[PDB]
Every structure is written in C-alpha cells, then in structure tokens.
Amino acid sequence: EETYTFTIFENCRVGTTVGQVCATDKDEPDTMHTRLKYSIIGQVPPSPTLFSMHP
C-alpha cells in the first residue's frame, strides 16, 4: 500500500503492536538484491514520540 491504516486502543501498554506492513523486491528471493530494511522517517505530530518499527 502507498498509505496504510491501523487501529489501536487508548491506554495500551508499551511494546503494543500497531500493525505489520509488507513489501517485495523484484530481484532473486533471499539474496542481498532483495534483502530488506524498514525504518520510520517521521511522525504527526513529530513529537512526542509514540511509535517504533523493527528494522
């Protein structure tokens, strides 16, 4: 997706899941040509921080 949406509850505990996104690359599966790394680039608002991503 170009734009996902996820739901969570209020007052949930740290380390709570929001959602998992998926992606693909068009080179040979399980080579470095296709080996992937995920990161947050920003937030709305920018601060305070509320969410993280496993790389």
């Binding site: 709305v44 608002p45 920018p46 601060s47």
Partner: protein, 55 residues
C-alpha cells in the same frame, strides 16, 4: 539575515479547502533532492494541523 515576509488569510471562509496561501521552496533545489515541512503553533503545536505543506 533577511527577515521573513508576511502572508494573510481571511476568517470563516466558504472555501473550498485546502485554501492556498503561497508557495515556498529552495532556490538551490536543483543541486540535490529535498522535501518540505513545517513546525509550530498551527500544525504540530496547537491548534494542530491548521497548516499544511506539500512535501
């Protein structure tokens, strides 16, 4: 440094919205790829998301 430059908006408008105010970019944008943002009371300090920029 040169001082910043006014812009004005009129209250309780029949729109439509997003209502445009002015465009602001770099001049040196042609040297390397950049993207645009704003912070402050009116987007991420309150009243939040009052103001908006095309990235």
């Amino acid at each position: 440094r040169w001082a910043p430059i006014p812009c004005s908006m009129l209250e309780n408008s029949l729109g439509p919205f997003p209502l445009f105010l002015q465009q602001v970019q770099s001049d040196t944008a042609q040297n390397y790829t950049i993207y645009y943002s704003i912070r402050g009371p009116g987007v991420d300090q309150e009243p939040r998301n009052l103001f908006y920029v095309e990235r």
